[PDB]
């Protein structure tokens, strides 16, 4: 479950993982099925929390699940159905979440401030051709929101084609936090991506990451399991970084380290090839920078 390709190499290796209906893809994929099976998730499954988790069947490992202050003894208190994840950067880099549900949205605003979160990145629109995905658990006006204990305010909101960009200020009681939240509302469909839906995506991991470099805290990315489309703007923002630096990927070792944090990250086959065509992109485009000499 690591496979580092020389970039020279990667046209000819994605090109061989295709043959066959894409078999040897399948068969990364089912290598990477089986990690995590049998690590705890003990908290995930305590009665008082199954009505905090989304789905059933994508519960937060117990060694790495985002932990919330509890005043209490009840059963569950420090519970939300969220996830530290490694990056290029940081071990805690990321949190892995579900999209907030109504009874659990005061708790994901808990966390964004107990976290110490300045960023949290969004995958999904609220409903998507007539299913829940998502609680549109931020405001909707300008007007200050209480959400349990930490209110909301919207400071601006602005939005393009393919994503919004809105700054929030929260705040409990005496404490304030400034937290950016990007929106990416365009998410294709089911299933080869256009060259532009590529393109989109990785402008979109682009701006994240500006934006990180003069944030601190751990990054808040969520789709509506957490895991999907999550693990995949994860691991194209960890690799757009890499690929700046090296000469080489590993999106397999990638993905399984990813797996180890959280369950089922990259969900589908298809998102799983998808990063494979984004790493194409992301190859061209060193390429293309190769012809500029600067040093
Ligand atoms: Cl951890
Ligand atoms: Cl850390
Ligand atoms: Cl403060
Ligand atoms: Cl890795
Ligand atoms: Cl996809």
């Given at each position: 479950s690591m496979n580092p390709v020389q970039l020279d190499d990667f046209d000819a290796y994605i090109k061989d993982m295709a043959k066959d209906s894409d078999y040897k893809f399948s068969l990364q994929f089912e290598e990477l099925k089986?990690?995590?099976?049998?690590?705890?998730?003990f908290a995930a499954d305590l009665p008082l929390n199954r009505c905090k988790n989304?789905?059933?069947?994508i519960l937060p490992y117990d060694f790495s699940r985002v932990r919330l202050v509890s005043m209490?003894?009840?059963?569950?208190?420090?519970?939300?159905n969220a996830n530290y994840i490694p990056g290029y950067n940081s071990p805690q880099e990321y949190i892995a979440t579900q999209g907030p549900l109504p009874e659990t949205r005061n708790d994901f605003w808990k966390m964004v401030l107990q976290q110490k979160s300045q960023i949290i990145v969004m995958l999904?629109?609220?409903?998507?051709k007539r299913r829940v995905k998502?609680?549109?658990?931020?405001?909707?006006?300008?007007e200050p929101i209480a959400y349990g204990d930490i209110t909301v305010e919207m400071i601006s909101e602005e939005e393009q084609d393919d994503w919004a960009c809105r700054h929030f200020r929260i705040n409990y009681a005496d404490e304030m936090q400034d937290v950016m939240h990007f929106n990416?509302?365009?998410?294709?469909?089911?299933?080869?991506?256009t060259a532009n839906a590529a393109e989109s995506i990785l402008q979109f991991v682009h701006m994240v990451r500006q934006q990180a470099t003069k944030s601190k805290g751990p990054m808040i990315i969520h789709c509506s399991?957490?895991?999907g489309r999550t693990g995949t703007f994860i691991a194209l923002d960890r690799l757009l970084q890499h690929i700046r630096d090296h000469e080489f990927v590993d999106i397999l070792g990638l993905v399984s380290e990813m797996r180890s944090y959280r369950?089922?990250?990259?969900?589908?086959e298809e998102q799983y090839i998808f990063i494979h065509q984004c790493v194409q992109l992301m190859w061209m485009k060193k390429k293309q920078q190769f012809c500029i000499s600067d040093v």
């Open positions: 089986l990690i995590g099976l049998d690590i705890p998730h989304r789905y059933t069947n209490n003894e009840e059963e569950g208190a420090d519970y939300i999904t629109q609220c409903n998507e998502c609680d549109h658990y931020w405001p909707f006006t300008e990416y509302t365009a998410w294709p469909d089911h299933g080869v991506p399991a957490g895991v369950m089922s990250m990259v969900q589908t």
